[PDB]
From Swiss-Prot, chain A:
Small GTPase which cycles between an active GTP-bound and an inactive GDP-bound state. Mainly associated with cytoskeleton organization, in active state binds to a variety of effector proteins to regulate cellular responses such as cytoskeletal dynamics, cell migration and cell cycle. Regulates a signal transduction pathway linking plasma membrane receptors to the assembly of focal adhesions and actin stress fibers. Involved in a microtubule-dependent signal that is required for the myosin contractile ring formation during cell cycle cytokinesis. (Microbial infection) Serves as a target for the yopT cysteine peptidase from Yersinia pestis, vector of the plague. Changing T18N: Decreased Rho protein signal transduction. Decreased substrate adhesion-dependent cell spreading. Decreased stress fibers assembly. Decreased cytoplasmic microtubule organization. A motif (Effector region) lies at residues 33-41. It catalyses: GTP + H2O = GDP + phosphate + H(+). PROSITE patterns: RHO. Changing G13V: Increased Rho protein signal transduction. Constitutively active. This is Transforming protein RhoA. Keywords: ADP-ribosylation, Cell cycle, Cell division, Cell membrane, Cell projection, Cytoplasm, Cytoskeleton, Disease variant, Ectodermal dysplasia, Glycoprotein, GTP-binding, Host-virus interaction, Hydrolase, Isopeptide bond, Lipoprotein, Magnesium, Membrane, Methylation, Nucleotide-binding, Nucleus, Phosphoprotein, Prenylation, Proto-oncogene, Ubl conjugation. Pfam families: Ras (PF00071). It comes from Homo sapiens. The modification 5-glutamyl serotonin is found at Q62.
UniProtKB/Swiss-Prot annotation, chain B:
It is linked to A chromosomal aberration involving ARHGEF12 may be a cause of acute leukemia. Translocation t(11;11)(q23;23) with KMT2A/MLL1. Transmembrane segments: none annotated. Interacts with GNA12 and GNA13, probably through the RGS-like domain. Interacts with RHOA, PLXNB1 and PLXNB2. Interacts through its PDZ domain with IGF1R beta subunit. Interacts with GCSAM. Found in a complex with ARHGEF11 and ARHGEF12; binding to ARHGEF11 and ARHGEF12 enhances CDC42 GEF activity of PLEKHG4B, and PLEKHG4B, in turn, inhibits ARHGEF11- and ARHGEF12-mediated RHOA activation. It is found in: Cytoplasm; Membrane. This is Rho guanine nucleotide exchange factor 12. May play a role in the regulation of RhoA GTPase by guanine nucleotide-binding alpha-12 (GNA12) and alpha-13 (GNA13). Acts as guanine nucleotide exchange factor (GEF) for RhoA GTPase and may act as GTPase-activating protein (GAP) for GNA12 and GNA13. The chain holds residues 766 to 1138 of 1544 of the full protein. Residues 22-212 form the DH domain. Ubiquitously expressed. Isoform 2 is found in jejunum and testis. Residues 254-356 form the PH domain. The gene is ARHGEF12. It comes from Homo sapiens. Signal peptide: none annotated.
Amino acid sequence: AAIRKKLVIVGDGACGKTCLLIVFSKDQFPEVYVPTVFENYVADIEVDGKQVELALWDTAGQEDYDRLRPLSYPDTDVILMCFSIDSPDSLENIPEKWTPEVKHFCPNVPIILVGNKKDLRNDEHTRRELAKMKQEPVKPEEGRDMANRIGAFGYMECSAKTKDGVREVFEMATRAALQA
Amino acid sequence: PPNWQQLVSREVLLGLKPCEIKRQEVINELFYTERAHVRTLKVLDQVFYQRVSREGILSPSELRKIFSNLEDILQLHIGLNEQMKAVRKRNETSVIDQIGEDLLTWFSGPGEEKLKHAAATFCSNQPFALEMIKSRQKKDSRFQTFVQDAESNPLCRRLQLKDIIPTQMQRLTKYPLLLDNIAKYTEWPTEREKVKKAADHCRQILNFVNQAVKEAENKQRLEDYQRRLDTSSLKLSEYPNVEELRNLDLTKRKMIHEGPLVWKVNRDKTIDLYTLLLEDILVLLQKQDDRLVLRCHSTFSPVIKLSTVLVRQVATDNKALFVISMSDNGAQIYELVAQTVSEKTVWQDLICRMAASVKEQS
């Protein structure tokens, strides 16, 4: 038989979860139209020579329905918790809001912190809108220090505006998911 | 696969500004998504509900426990979709012109009322549906045989039964995104505002379905906590308050909110409860093996009438909530700390609001 795993991707709303599942699955950033929707979809993937069947569950739009949202979690096998590298407000929700939940509803499910939108850690605009609020983009240490703090299985950043280091996220979640 | 632009003539598109194209790209999604949904719902009906029903494996209440009103909704979407097919014919072009009226029609008004009721009954049953599948699978040669074989129909797309049931909740959830995008690329004032409202009503639908689901498992959770309760250590002889207390039956109340709290009742005596704010009382249990214990140490009772409650903020600890309980005897304070501010802020608010809801039922 084959090895099914369920990966859920939680995290604040505004930081690109759907797409990152699109980009991972089609394996190509869509230039034409980024869908608003992504369906429970089973992605074929191999890691470490094992053949895996990663079943991918978006949670986009469940951010505000706190008793809905949990329907996504049950029987999950790895979790991509994530946050926008240009939104340090998202970063601090991680220990405040998602880790507590995920560790409740999905207990002993390995987490994978993820700095999405990495490619705006150097944007002119982005620096300078955050700089109106005293804030600044997430430094890659900050990111790791969060993932070690929240008891994650690893950290990972990746480009929003393309395909970048998006495979490497899913290879790693797939590695985690394979452990017990 | 394919975007909207694949279907339109090169020349048609070149008559459209680059974001009217975008709106189209979305509206197209709204529509083709709806269909996919409707397809899944059908799988559920044809692949699963219908063949097991026929097979004989499940009884007619086990059937309903698993599948519940999958019909009512299947049909709801089926019809919501032909309503969309409709909207496509309207226009000679494949440029779906103004779509606002139609979004209010499907999502506001009496469409709202249909979707939210049918949804809530479907979506909320899931917990209880999944329990059944998981159970009746360990419990039955044939039922498990059956789900397995059914899962291998390529209509499934290699999703399992349990992976397909959560979907009604899923769609509902996306409606206010799609609308918000459509609305976002909608150049025209008077019709943008329509789309913006239709989105709003897809939210109100959500909260409803959310609040449906909360109630429905909160019922089943009191049924369980009440069963794993303990009042043996309850002092027959101290305060005649206490028949109401031995005989307390969580199960007759609506549970508004719950979770684990830390009772600082002294700097040398500080407890960790598991706390139920029910409809009319607040309850202060102690987890202990499985049994949750109803007890009252140095007396402060573990139950607190919300008619007497006043909350106050503890201006040092940012996680601590001064729950006064105002009586004719004294006024007994229950200083309570949470794990994260974010919790305290909701304890504060749900308590504060119950207090005044209850007191305003004179």
